[PDB]
Subunit: 294 residues, 2 copies
Amino acid sequence: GHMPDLADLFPGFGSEWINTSSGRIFARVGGDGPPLLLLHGFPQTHVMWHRVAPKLAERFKVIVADLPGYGWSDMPESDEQHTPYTKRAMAKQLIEAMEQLGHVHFALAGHDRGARVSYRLALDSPGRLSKLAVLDILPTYEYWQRMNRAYALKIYHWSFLAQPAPLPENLLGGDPDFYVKAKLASWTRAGDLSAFDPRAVEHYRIAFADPMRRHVMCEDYRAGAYADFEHDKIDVEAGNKIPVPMLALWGAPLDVWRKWASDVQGAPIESGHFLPEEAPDQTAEALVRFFSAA
Amino acid sequence: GHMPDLADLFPGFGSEWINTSSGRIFARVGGDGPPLLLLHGFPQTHVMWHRVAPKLAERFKVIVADLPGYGWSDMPESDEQHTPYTKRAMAKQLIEAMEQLGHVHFALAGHDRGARVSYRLALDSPGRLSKLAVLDILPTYEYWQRMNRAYALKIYHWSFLAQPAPLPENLLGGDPDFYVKAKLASWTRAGDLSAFDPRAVEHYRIAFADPMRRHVMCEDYRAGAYADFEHDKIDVEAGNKIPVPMLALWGASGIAQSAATPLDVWRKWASDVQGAPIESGHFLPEEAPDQTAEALVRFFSAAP
Ligand SMILES: [Cl-]
Ligand SMILES: [Cl-]
Ligand code: NI
Ligand code: NI
């Protein structure tokens, strides 16, 4: 009775509680073939991949993981530098988990915060990856360097959620269900929840309802403003580029990704932010093609 | 029986609810001399002037007003452009209030949002003013032009409160007393509430406890992100400068200095401006009342 009996949106997939030095990672595991790890972002959990994972599982062993501190993964204790919720730390943790599953090398696709984990993992440990896909992001450095009025107003949450505790946490606590539902609605094409399966929205809402989970999300954004930014700035100063074959998908950027990656393909997808849920067929097909190439 | 029973922070001053075409303005009115309007900002009310008002009342008729929609002033119905909470509209409304009081010309000092009212009023209607003082600000345009990663983190509320309704309103409902007290403390030198009279803090808390009042504040920040910025941008493109004799005061550790040297910015905006720092954070009249009152008295007064 320690976990809610939420809807199963991955029929046929198993459940794994994977040990790491920073805590357990929860994942769904399905398919057969070369390993492909899929990482969600904010304010979601691993269930966001439920419409694309079955297709991918024809050709790949698909591992659909809750990021450190999100969903059902354990929540390591943070510190004043937000260390465990840095993308560098999260990447190291997820490497530990994949090694538990039998995989020293793997393919990787990430969305939003999970895409940030993914490009940081590719910078820090490129040898771990066969191929990388990032969905609807630019590097964290790039978002901050372009900060001006227009962006401050659009991505206000990068600066609000990064304010020192307990400010955002005390505000999110009033009506968390409103905040989470309006965030998911507002960055879809339609501007409503019609794109999401209601069972998926329930997973998101149940996660967001827990104050400890919301504190993790704020620590993630505090890393995003500080350590993650400094980590990216070090790579910019040395002109470091990802050598892993990469695919950048975005909701209707490749020019930004060339500065950061020496072998990058891209495509627009007819979607708002939430590509795997808004445009599952088009997203699945792009990823299937990319990851099947050798 | 609905009012709280609170001590008078302006002994000797009258209390007036002044009619305008947009709604009443509440003000305390004291002293003797030519008129001087004082305009507070966020998340405050007219009581923020309570430590400098007595000194200024020695030589001036001091009119200490709650901004449109703040404190005890009426809340004009907003619209999609947040018109009544634009600094242009607030300026027009406070001009109506001063005219009802019998003052077609006056001297003006403003802090924070009230300083934004005040420079907009000087741009739009310079003939109304004898002298202008702005405290701890640069023009809205200048903050936005400097809105990089560091400033986006420091003055996050400029972007947060400007999100479309009901996002910030619903969040602020989460713990409004914490929010206002944290805002007030964060912009002080000590980083706590020790600079403020606890009785003034209670005024600010009571105001902020009201959801209709918090909605006004958000509309003010929406105006600050949109129409107020555009109105500034028009003047900057034209090279329009404030012609009124002006004073810019700022905190040595306040908001305006954070990403600028303020006197040189104001010289881009004003042809007859003087300025100086005050040893303070953002809340000059409460953190540094003696220094601030002296500066103000010297600037507005013809006597040394
Ligand atoms: Cl490596
Ligand atoms: Cl005029
Ligand atoms: Ni259990
Ligand atoms: Ni009553």
